[model samples]
Target chain A: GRIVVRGDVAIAEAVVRKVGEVAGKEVILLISYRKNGEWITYQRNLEATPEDVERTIAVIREIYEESGGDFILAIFSD
Target chain B: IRCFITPDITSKDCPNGHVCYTKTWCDAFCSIRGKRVDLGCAATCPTVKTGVDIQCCSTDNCNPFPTR
Candidate 1:
C-alpha cells in the first residue's frame, strides 16, 4: 500500500522554468511515512549541497524499503 | 489545453484538448486507500472521492500537486 497523498516526485528541474508556474525560489524536500494507519509528512528546506541530495535520496530509499516512505521535492508555491 | 504529463511529478508536454491531473491517496489515507502522484494528461480527469485528492487543469503545463 502507498501513503503519499500529495506533491509527488523530486523533479526539481522541471519546476524551475515554465509558463503559469510559480515554483518558488525555495526548495523543499519532503518525506512522508505511514504511522498508526495515517500518514505523517516531514520536510526540510536545507540539505548539504552536492552530495546532500544524493545522500537524502539514498536515505529515502532505505526508509521506503522498510515502511514504504516516499521522497518528494515539493514546489514552494500553491 | 496542453498539460504536464508524468507517471511521477516529472513533467512533459501533453497533447492539446487533454486535461492534466495529479492524483494521490493513502493506503486507506481516506484513501490507497497505495499512493503515488500519478501526474499526467488524459481525456478524463479524476472523479474526487474520500481518501483521494485529485486536481485537474486545462491549460498548458499547469498541473502540479493536489491537496489532500
Candidate 2:
C-alpha cells in the first residue's frame, strides 16, 4: 500500500542500521515474497535491526519497484 | 538462533558441513566435522522444503565445533 515514497535506499539503509544494531547479534537480511505462488529471496546483508526496517522497505521497493507489492519479512526472531 | 536463506538453507552462502533447518525446530552440534557447541531453537515447527511460510525458528547452523 506504500508507493511513490519507496525505493529510497538512503532511507532503507538508515532504518536497517538502526534496528539491526539493537538486535545485539549479527543480522541476516532478506528481501523476499511470493508472486503467483512462487517464493523468492534477495540477499541484502547479514545483519540489521528495527531502524533498518526503513532501509529494508526501500530496498524491497526498488527490487519490486515496478510491482509495488508487499515484501515479505523473513526475520529469524523479530 | 535463527537464519534466513531463500529457496533452501543449504545454499552455498549458508555454509557447508552444517545441517540447516528452516521451519521451526533445528539444533544439532557437530563433534569434529561441522559446527559444534551450538544451542538454540527449542521450539517445534515444520521443515523447510522448497516453498513454504517460514516462521519462528526459521533456520540455524554454526561452524564446526572447536576441538579441545
Candidate 3:
C-alpha cells in the first residue's frame, strides 16, 4: 500500500528558495504530513555551504528511516 | 494565473478559487491542496516569510519553478 505521498521535488526547491532564510544563513523548514493515520514531521535546513546542506539532509533522512512514516527531503539551500 | 511548472507545460492559470503559491523551499504551484500539500510548501506567498522566496505571481504563467 502506497500510503505515502512524496511532494513534487521541483516544487520543493522553489518553496525553499521562496521561503528560505537569508542566502548565507542557516534555517530549518519543517514539514508535517499525515501518514497512515498519524501526523509525521520532517525537516531540512537551508545554509550557504554544501556541507551544512548535506548534514541537514542526513539528519532528516535518519529520522525518517527510524520512523518509517512520511518524510521527504525536498530541498536544502540558502 | 501563475503556477508550478509542470512537465507537460511550462505553466498555467490557477483555478478560480486558488492562488499561485510557493509554500516552502522551491516548490511553486496553484493551490495549497491536493498534490501541493505533499511538499509542505502549501502556504500562500505572503505568509511564509517576507522576501524569503514564496511567490504569489499573478501574471500569466509567472510562477515558474524549474522542472526536474
Candidate 4:
C-alpha cells in the first residue's frame, strides 16, 4: 500500500492498499486506514469540501492511472 | 522530536546521546525480496512500526541502536 498526504491545515494521511483497472478506470481499496491528528478537527470535515482522506484518495487514483505500481507509505518522526 | 541522519548528516555529526530510528513497511510484492528496508527516525518522535524490527521505550528516547 502507498500513502498520500493531503491538506496543509487539518492534514491527513491516506494509505491505499490496492488499486486495479475497473471498467477502464482506476479504483482503489483502502485497507489499513487511519484518520485524526493534531492538525485535524471536527469542523474540517463539514465544509462540504474534501478532507484529507478524500483528497489523498483522489491523488492516489490519479497516480495509479498514470503509472501502475505497488508501493508503501513510511513515516519517520524526529 | 529529532530525526535520524538524513542524506546530509551522518551519525557522528549529531551530538552525544543522539540516536536514529529505522522504520519500514512494504507491500506483498517486496516481502519475498527480503522483508522491507529500514528507515531512520529520531528520539522522542512519534512513529509507528509493524513487525519484528520495532524497539525503543518511552523513557527519554531510549534504544536507538539495537543490542549487540
Error of model 4, residue B42, in angstroms: 1.4
Residue lDDT tens for model 3, B1-68: 44554222235544552455544332332112112321111224456665244556455545433211
Q: lDDT (0-100) at residue A29 of candidate 2?
A: 46
Residue-pair clash count for candidate 3: 19
Best by TM-score: 1
Best lDDT among the predictions, by candidate number: 1
lDDT of each: 0.47, 0.38, 0.41, 0.30
TM-scores for every candidate against the unseen true structure = 0.42, 0.31, 0.33, 0.25
Question: What lDDT is obtained when candidate 2 is compared to the true structure?
Answer: 0.38
Question: For candidate 1, what is the DockQ-based docking class?
Answer: incorrect
- Weakest lDDT window of 10 consecutive positions for candidate 4 chain A: A38-47
Residue B3 miss distance in model 1 (angstroms)? 2.3
Kindly list the per-residue Cα lDDT of model 4 for residues B1-68, writing each as its tens digit: 24333222223323433445544345453312223333244444335655535443333333332111
Superposed on the true chain A, the predicted chain A of model 3 yields a TM-score of 0.41
In TM-score terms, candidate 1 sits at: 0.42
Model 4, A1-78: lDDT tens digits are 233333221222222222221122332222111233211101011112234335544544533433332322222111
In model 1, the runs with Cα more than 4 Å from the true position are A1-27, A30-78, B28-35, B65-68
By lDDT, is 1 or 4 better? Answer: 1
